[PDB]
Paper text:
CAPs are multi-domain, multifunctional proteins that oligomerize into hexamers and promote rapid actin filament turnover in vitro and in cells. The C-terminal half of CAPs harbors two proline-rich regions, PP1 and PP2, which bind to profilin and SH3 domain proteins, respectively, and a Wiscott Aldrich Syndrome protein homology 2 (WH2) domain, which binds to both ADP-actin and ATP-actin monomers. The CARP domain of CAPs binds specifically to ADP-G-actin, and together with the adjacent WH2 domain catalyzes nucleotide exchange on actin monomers. Collectively, our study uncovers the molecular mechanism by which the WH2 and CARP domains of CAP associate with actin monomers and accelerate nucleotide exchange on ADP-actin.
To reveal the principles of CAP–actin interactions, we crystallized the CARP domain of mouse non-muscle isoform, CAP1 (CAP1317–474) in complex with unmodified muscle ADP-G-actin. Crystals diffracted anisotropically to 2.3 Å in the c direction, and to 3.2–3.3 Å in the a and b directions. The obtained crystal structure of a symmetric complex containing a dimer of the CARP domain bound to two ADP-actin monomers reveals several new and unexpected features. First, each actin monomer in the complex contacts each of the two subunits in the CARP homodimer, and each CARP monomer (within the homodimer) binds to two actin monomers using two distinct interfaces. This results in a sandwich-like structure, with the CARP homodimer squeezed between two ADP-actin molecules. All of these other proteins bind to the “front side” or the barbed end interface of actin between subdomains 1 and 3, whereas the CARP domain binds to the “back side” on subdomains 1, 2, and 3 of actin. The “primary interface” of the CARP domain on subdomains 1 and 3 of actin overlaps with the binding site of profilin on actin. However, the “secondary interface”, formed between the second CARP monomer and actin subdomain 2, is different from the interaction sites of other actin monomer-binding proteins characterized so far. In the crystal structure, the D-loop of actin subdomain 2 has a pulled-back conformation and associates with the secondary interface of the CARP domain. Our structure revealed that the C-terminal tail of the CARP domain forms a hydrogen bond between a backbone oxygen of CARP Ala473 and the imidazole ring of actin His73.
Residue numbers in the entry:
A (entry chain B), C (entry chain B): 317 to 473
B (entry chain A), D (entry chain A): 5 to 375
Write the structure that this text describes.
């Protein structure tokens, strides 16, 4: 119903966007943050280094960014494509279903945090004109050892 | 109303009509995509190739294997495998046929929910159903209780089942199957001076394996029989018309199933994994699992496999215990055969999840209706 | 709106129960399974050994059982108390929020499988007239090692 | 309209009114329950005791520590801590006061959502807010950028913050804090022949620690000064009126913070964890974090702690680098002080999440409104 993209204080208000493939945040400063909310079937690109990014309640979203200081957080969303062109220390995928983290040749140390999520794939680029896909686990096994709970990752390899 | 049965395999998709003696379509569960590396966000998704077409264009395309380990990891890729199954392989309208889907063991609740979603929302199906693979294989042998050894293309599972309900703590995954045996056969054929490297040459190795490879009752007895005489040696004709003579490779290739140390695997053998699984199960059910061992999928088609299984299980289990390995000749398609018989039954039309039901409950309805 | 507890074929249909503290399934056979659906603020007790139990879309549910052959599966629920008096090989907690697994002195080898869940606690009994509480992890850390994704459990200890 | 600030600590809950110079209520975040062992399913939940009352009745009650490690693991227990905070400690009606809650670092999205739910649904609050602990401590020093070293009762965190947004990859958890130092002080006081064992005797050890324990600038220089003369030795009066003389225990107890090997911990010291955390951060922010080190919580109240921190960080960081450790005397309640100043600001009434807003979006509104 409503629709806006604007810098409110220090944060980018990318809200209620519905079917827009050419969406670019060109002017940027380390200080600034981004909050993408209620975007359905839209593609967005943040150019430059910024503090942090959050994606809340987005359906079929696609985000490309250059560099991040803090974290990129994908929350209560579905079918989200996220990509680094530069560096990103952490990618958090929380209560989201279908999330494709396309990393960059620098973001290879990127920590992918997951919680209440599914269909998560970490895309690692090769020198072959493509990316190799790798699924993120989503089921876990806790045991009573006699002194403490021991939780192990239910592998897909 | 002609219902479809779709077995989503780690190596091959098996599809057709419920009631038919075998799957009408059998193709590689591979999706091939053009190579891209820039801004990787989809505006309006271009061209894609599925199955044998994908696999052949291996060099020039990035190939996606979404069912690689039994569990579907990518839904856009899966939708492409399903859309190719419907319109191109089976040449039918999904909107007119209720559809049954096979599911891997230890499949996430979210995974079964998404299967339901895609079926109703992305293919407009009148009804659908999610049944577990090992269960359908057991159901084919008429049994509802037994330990199924399912050896497919990319994964091997031991699945204990009591009254049509799998015992998940005792399910054993062994990431050693069909593609691994074909690979090893290629590795050990280099020894005799034969060089199979092209995607096209692999097809010949797969052919050799399927035709000449047997499971030895006693590996060392056979390795000495192969060393003393050329009695066990056999000839194979290549496409060009040349004849190659293969020796001990015949039994050394499916011996990796029992001895994984042959490919550098720390994993225990299929006989060990079976025993271990029955041992994990309750003392009150162990007898039924011992007496009802059901073999399923392509990588169980080897001659002598069941005889060896008997011999190795008799060895680990108590002296008193009765062991019966069951290897139906249909075992290569027994999951599909099961689902075919199931969707066929007149006392199953109640069991389907209809779009009227989905319109109300959503994908969560799979847990209730597919119990 | 509707309300029923009955043996349909081989499965117990404990459905649409709303505020009932004294609910017991007395007659039981190994062969039989239980499917507790849409129960709000009710307490149920299964007496004897049965095949399996599932709890789907239940709010503030409390289940006590004796012995299980297969698995107990808690699905799309909230505020669920589950207890073994005997043996249970696996407890699966899937898309549920608030789940208290009270184990038994035999069920100490019980595997607690978790997926898309939160507020999970494994209650281990002591010879002191109570149980010691232990939380189940719910946030995870995946890394690219250079050849494969490595997922580690974000501990709470 | 008088707004409440509630800091949910791992050891102590700090509550009061936004605007007040310090928390009105400071009690143990312990819930005590009667001992039960049968059918453990709640019909209509009986009696419970919170805080000092719980802690004193330790022997006869099963005590629950829901915030034990910073993150709330039990909501029925948390509702009891909150209901005791409102009606019994602060003696106010939650329905009349907008409420601010402090949150641990690396807190789950579900955890913040449930905080919102309980506040609105279980306490009927007019509005509420979720703010991160380390952030509120930084906000107290007027700063929005810095590395906060928060040492509380049960957990120690290093939290780098850039423009009021925490850098989660660089957050460092050290499960060594206040309760550990008190425990070690008890262990090393047994040496001099003093025996503190009762829950009541622990209170004396906590008192000694808080009063006589200092952080040595150079541990070995002090261990030799303590060995040569009784210059560093000090006297302490016990409740009964006896006087005990404590020596080297004075500096050996908070030296565990820097040398965890003293309690058998493989963990690196608070100086190491700080450096390591700044190193994990981007090269473009490291200078600001070096110059803006903010100390917070009870276990930072030790004398000499900041001087040592300067000395150890100067040692690891490059020779050129400027380091400024900031230890405000208010640091024991700086999280609460921060939230107090925040809920007070007239340019914050916009920031609250109202029940009218909650009635629409539900608990998911916390991510948007508390960003
Ligand atoms: N006659 C045969 N003998 C031995 N192996 C076979 C035979 N037929 C098929 N296979 C092998 O088994 C695999 C196919 O098994 P299948 O059960 O369909 O797998 P999935 O369901 O995992 O896709 C292939 O690797 C194939 O080469
Ligand atoms: N003056 C003091 N000197 C040293 N330690 C102190 C002092 N005051 C409090 N502490 C200790 O610090 C802890 C309380 O710290 P606090 O920040 O309130 O913890 P939390 O927020 O984790 O509940 C207790 O273990 C207490 O003994
Ligand atoms: Mg299969
Ligand atoms: Mg604190």
């Amino acid at each position: 119903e409503p629709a806006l993209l604007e810098l409110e204080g220090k944060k980018w208000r990318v809200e209620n966007q519905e079917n827009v493939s050419n969406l670019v945040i060109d002017d940027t400063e380390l200080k600034q943050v981004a909050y993408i909310y209620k975007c359905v079937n839209t593609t967005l690109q943040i150019k430059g280094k910024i503090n942090s990014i959050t994606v809340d309640n987005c359906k079929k979203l696609g985000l490309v960014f250059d560099d991040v200081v803090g974290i990129v957080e994908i929350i209560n969303s579905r079918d989200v494509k996220v990509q680094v062109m530069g560096k990103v220390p952490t990618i958090s995928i929380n209560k989201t279903d279908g999330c494709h983290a396309y990393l960059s040749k620098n973001s290879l140390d990127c920590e992918i945090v997951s919680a209440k999520s599914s269909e998560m794939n970490v895309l690692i680029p090769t020198e072959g004109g493509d990316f190799n896909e790798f699924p993120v686990p989503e089921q876990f096994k806790t045991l009573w050892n006699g002194q403490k709970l021991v939780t192990t990752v239910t592998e897909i390899a | 109303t002609t219902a479809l049965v779709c077995d989503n395999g780690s190596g091959l998709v098996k599809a057709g009509f419920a009631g038919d003696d075998a799957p009408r379509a059998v193709f590689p569960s591979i999706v091939g995509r053009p190579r891209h590396q820039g801004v990787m966000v989809g505006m309006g998704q271009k061209d894609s190739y599925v199955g044998d077409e994908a696999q052949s264009k291996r060099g020039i395309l990035t190939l996606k294997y979404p069912i690689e380990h039994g569990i579907i990891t990518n839904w856009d890729d899966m939708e492409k495998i399903w859309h190719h199954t419907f319109y191109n392989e089976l040449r039918v309208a999904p909107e007119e046929h209720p559809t049954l889907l096979t599911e891997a063991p230890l499949n996430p609740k979210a995974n079964r929910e998404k299967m339901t979603q895609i079926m109703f929302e992305t293919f407009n199906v009148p009804a659908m159903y999610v049944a577990i693979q090992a269960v359908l294989s057991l159901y084919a042998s008429g049994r509802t209780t037994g330990i199924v050894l399912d050896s497919g293309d990319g994964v091997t599972h031991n699945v204990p089942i009591y009254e049509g309900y799998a015992l998940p703590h005792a399910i054993m995954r062994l990431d050693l199957a069909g593609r691994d045996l074909t690979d090893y056969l290629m590795k050990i054929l280099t020894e005799r001076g034969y060089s199979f490297v092209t995607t096209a040459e692999r097809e010949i190795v797969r052919d050799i394996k399927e035709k000449l490879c047997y499971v030895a009752l006693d590996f060392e007895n056979e390795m000495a029989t192969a060393a003393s005489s050329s009695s066990l040696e056999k000839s194979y004709e290549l496409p060009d018309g040349q004849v190659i003579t293969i020796g001990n490779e015949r039994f050394r290739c499916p011996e990796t199933l029992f001895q994984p140390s042959f490919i550098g695997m720390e994993s225990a053998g299929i006989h060990e994994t079976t025993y271990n699984s029955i041992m994990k199960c309750d003392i009150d059910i162990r007898k039924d699992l011992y007496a009802n061992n059901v073999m399923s999928g392509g990588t169980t088609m080897y001659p002598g496999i069941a005889d060896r299984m008997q011999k190795e299980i008799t060895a680990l289990a108590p002296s008193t215990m009765k062991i019966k390995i069951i290897a139906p000749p249909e075992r290569k398609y027994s999951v599909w055969i099961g689902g075919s018989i199931l969707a066929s039954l007149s006392t199953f039309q109640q069991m389907w999840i209809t779009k009227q039901e989905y319109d109300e409950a959503g994908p969560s309805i799979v847990h209730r209706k597919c119990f």
